[PDB]
């Protein structure tokens, strides 16, 4: 069964996933927070430059299939959202 996917942010490309804008900060997003259209999610460092993501239909983080800060490949779900 490959469907019913809540709302992940699979690295749109061969970039990197992130959840901390500042060194030891309050992270970008964590399971429990309810995102909302126009609400920066995480950083998609594509090539090396951050690529902040803005909600497209709100939602609620459910888990980070991907680590925190590391490279990834297209279709590589990182931040899961309900």
Swiss-Prot record:
Molecular function terms from GO: acetyl-CoA carboxylase activity; molecular adaptor activity
Keywords carried by this UniProt record: Biotin, Fatty acid biosynthesis, Fatty acid metabolism, Lipid biosynthesis, Lipid metabolism
Residues with the N6-biotinyllysine modification: 48
Domain of life, per lineage: Bacteria
One cellular component term from this protein's GO annotations in UniProt: acetyl-CoA carboxylase complex
GO BP terms: fatty acid biosynthetic process; malonyl-CoA biosynthetic process
Domain Biotinyl-binding: 1-82
Pathway assignment: Lipid metabolism; fatty acid biosynthesis
Subunit structure: Homodimer.
The protein's role, per its UniProt record: This protein is a component of the acetyl coenzyme A carboxylase complex; first, biotin carboxylase catalyzes the carboxylation of the carrier protein and then the transcarboxylase transfers the carboxyl group to form malonyl-CoA.
Protein name (Swiss-Prot/TrEMBL): Biotin carboxyl carrier protein of acetyl-CoA carboxylase
Organism name: Escherichia coli (strain K12)
Taxonomic path: Bacteria, Pseudomonadati, Pseudomonadota, Gammaproteobacteria, Enterobacterales
Gene name linked to the record: accB
Span covered, complete protein: 75 to 156 of 156
């Amino acid at each position: 069964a490959a469907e019913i996917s809540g709302h992940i942010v699979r690295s749109p490309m061969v970039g990197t996933f992130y959840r901390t804008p500042s060194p030891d900060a309050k992270a970008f997003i964590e399971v429990g927070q309810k995102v909302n259209v126009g609400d920066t999610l995480c950083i998609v460092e594509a090539m090396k430059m951050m690529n902040q993501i803005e909600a497209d239909k709100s939602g609620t983080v459910k888990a980070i299939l991907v680590e925190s800060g590391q490279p990834v490949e297209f279709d590589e779900p990182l931040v899961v959202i309900e």
